Write a protein that binds this ligand. Structure first.
Ligand SMILES: Cc1ncc(COP(=O)(O)O)c(/C=C/C(=O)C(=O)O)c1O
Ligand SMILES: Cc1ncc(COP(=O)(O)O)c(/C=C\C(=O)C(=O)O)c1O
Ligand SMILES: [Cl-]
Ligand code: NA
Ligand code: NA
Lengths: 427, 427
């Protein structure tokens, strides 16, 4: 009858009194960790004083203006316009309509197709599911909607062949050039991608990938959109994934990580180029002014202020990031059936493989991931299996102690993994 | 630059010290009226104690179970399964995917087309905007996606011709039969409609309309979906619009009215037929179990408990509804350029017309509505203009006094309207 009692820092406690390490930070979003009583209070205060604004007033609710001011301080230059939503899924959907509307305004109404990636995830809307490349969303029949295409994911371990990462990076990106040319540049609105594919299994692209993607977008006059749903609000040590990989998207989407998951909220950050365009069109002015649930906005403000003023983000870049990465590699590198050990900031992962030498994957990709995950679970550690990949994204406020503590349990579980593997003769 | 200070009951106050009557209850959703400090407290408590649950636990957060249990008590028979979202727009989107998935499971994957209405509104997603029939989101571009069709709205004043309401009702509904037959019954997944079209201008369908719609859906094995975004949580005096019009939809969608707008939340209520179907498919099990932001769920619980236990809904049926309707008609019936005075419960409206005898509308439908609205606004009353329709949906806790007070100001504004009409020679 196991029931969650409470959560604190990086831990969750059950009814039987057991403590669970949340190596996933809820749904990749509990960035400041659990237990932030101060957030409850910011909520209480805002609900009490002014939980609504009205379009009667022709102004913006002060708790939204506040959030916007602070966001502009932590986001790259030129991201002045922000459109608030209730979720990452809505952010994606809004982004889609914004991209299409932008081209309309430009007198290029046939520029409508957005390109995404297989094993990409952009939420659960029809719009987002059709943009995302999860294989079990696309055979559905209705997905994808037209104006959606997909290229293969830059996953080196499977698609690298004999190429080096850097080399594969150029190839993997060039798939965007192929798809654009195949479709017609005059029909393509945008490429959308997570800097690191989260739900795809923390597929980290080679260093050559993103600058090539961007060159291609610019070449063919296609907008570039980063989906910062998972990589946003300090996850890679930078404020946003795209900053780490060193590309400048024309828009980017954010989700409940903006509030550490405390209340539902998302946003679309819009750059100068597109902002100017949407304003002339006027379609979205209402959202840029009146968007943002005030209570949610106040909790988001608290969370971002914590992220900055408590040096949580800088700490990922400087201290806990490098440490986690080093320790992550140290801990996991040595296993027989564990390969492509990878990570940046506080997102990290590895893949379970049949044989590292041949770079051979297990059959029925995901069944072996399940087996490993059940173990982490029976051992009161939360790490998720995406197919045969194992992924972790703990709260950003995790300590060096907590790091070692988590890895300790993971270590033990993987030892147990190899055994059960041999014990079954699947090793 | 007027700034909203606070809100209380049905009133909002500005920085200049003026009091404004909110005849619209925010965005049709502030059902229990402003100032509910008890909601702040339910929020504060939930955020403090347990603002998250984890899928590790294989149970449902208690604040969600609670909400579900209470909802089941107030919703019609057979609406056991509920899927929570953050918004009305998401609810619509989820509903669409549910409908399509249901038919897949049934071995009928080509049953994909949903039918909506012109001047219908089902939110702002791509999915919802393509289902809705606002022609200002329905031109040359992305919308609509395939698997979306539209029939004309049952708007008597324009489409009635020489028929009586009840007569027109049968015709207007039969448009669904025409569209189905035109498309092929084997390709049609569902008909979706707001019991009363809200943002379309509170178009109230004849009494014959909905039972006919349902007969047609059942005839052709097409699902029937009510969009209770605006009509839900007591607006028509009943719990849900469809109860008032006497049809039983297989699913219905709900929005922030579930929480009186205090925190973002929505839901899809799923009937036995479809629930059974989606469970066999298993696609949606995760949401039926783990869906619902707990903080939002706790605020929603408070709001529903208030709606019931404080007899706010009953009060709309018995007391304030009849009164408002009577007084609404009394007040507005007598004007030269005001016709189709209409309403049920606490939703009510009228249309500005050039000449009532010919049933002739003003040209550039909406310009005249703008002029009237500016007046309500310059007089510190909130009522919205949808084209040339004028609509009101004040909080449900409005008193007889507040009713008369609102109508008083509206009266004056309409007197002023007629004059400015003559003064321009547009009368
Ligand atoms: C890449 C990516 N883009 C968009 C969304 C949509 O945000 P929501 O509206 O909060 O669902 C998700 C969400 C899914 C998870 O959070 C998860 O993977 O657990 C996502 O991963
Ligand atoms: C009929 C109808 N169906 C669905 C939605 C979507 O809910 P949200 O996720 O809250 O946007 C809306 C929303 C818009 C308004 O309420 C408004 O027009 O003020 C709606 O009117
Ligand atoms: Cl595979
Ligand atoms: Na901790
Ligand atoms: Na029920």
């Amino acid at each position: 009858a196991r029931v969650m009692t409470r959560g604190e820092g990086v831990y969750l406690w059950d009814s039987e009194g057991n403590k669970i390490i949340d190596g996933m930070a809820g749904l990749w979003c509990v960035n400041v960790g659990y237990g932030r009583k101060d957030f409850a209070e910011a909520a209480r205060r805002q609900m009490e004083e002014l939980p609504f604004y009205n379009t009667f007033f022709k102004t913006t609710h002060p708790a939204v203006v506040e959030l916007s001011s602070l966001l502009a301080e932590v986001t790259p230059a030129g991201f002045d316009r922000v459109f608030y939503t209730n979720s990452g899924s809505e952010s994606v959907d809004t982004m889609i309509r914004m991209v299409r509307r932008y081209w309309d305004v430009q007198g290029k109404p046939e520029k409508k197709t957005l390109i995404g990636r297989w094993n990409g995830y952009h939420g659960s809307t029809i719009g987002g599911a059709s943009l995302g490349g999860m294989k079990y969303m696309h055979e559905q029949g209705d997905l994808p909607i037209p104006g959606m295409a997909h290229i293969e994911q830059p996953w080196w371990y499977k698609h690298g062949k004999d190429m080096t990462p850097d080399e594969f990076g150029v190839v993997a990106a060039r798939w965007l050039e192929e798809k654009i040319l195949e479709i017609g540049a005059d029909k393509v609105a945008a490429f959308v991608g997570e800097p690191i594919q989260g739900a795809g299994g923390v597929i980290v692209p080679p260093a050559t990938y993103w600058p090539e993607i961007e060159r291609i977008c610019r070449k063919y006059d296609v907008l570039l959109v980063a989906d910062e749903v998972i990589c946003g609000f300090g996850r890679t040590g930078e404020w946003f994934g795209h900053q780490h990989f060193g590309f400048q998207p024309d828009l980017f989407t954010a989700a409940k990580g903006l509030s550490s998951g405390y209340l539902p909220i998302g946003a679309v950050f819009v750059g100068k180029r597109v902002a100017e365009g949407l304003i002339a069109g006027g379609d979205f002015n209402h959202g840029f002014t009146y968007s943002g649930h005030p209570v949610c906005a106040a909790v988001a403000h608290a969370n971002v202020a914590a992220l900055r003023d408590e040096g949580i983000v800088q700490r990922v870049k400087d201290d806990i990031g490098p440490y986690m990465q080093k320790r992550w590699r140290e801990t996991f590198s040595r296993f027989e059936h564990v390969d492509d050990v990878r990570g940046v900031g506080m997102v990290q992962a590895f893949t379970l493989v049949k044989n590292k030498a041949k770079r051979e994957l297990f059959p029925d990709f995901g069944e072996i991931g399940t087996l490993c995950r059940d173990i982490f679970f029976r051992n009161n550690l939360i790490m998720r299996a995406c197919g045969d990949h194992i992924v972790s994204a703990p709260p950003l406020v995790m300590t060096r102690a907590e790091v070692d503590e988590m890895l300790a349990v993971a270590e033990r579980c993987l030892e147990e993994f190899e055994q059960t593997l041999k014990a079954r003769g699947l090793a």
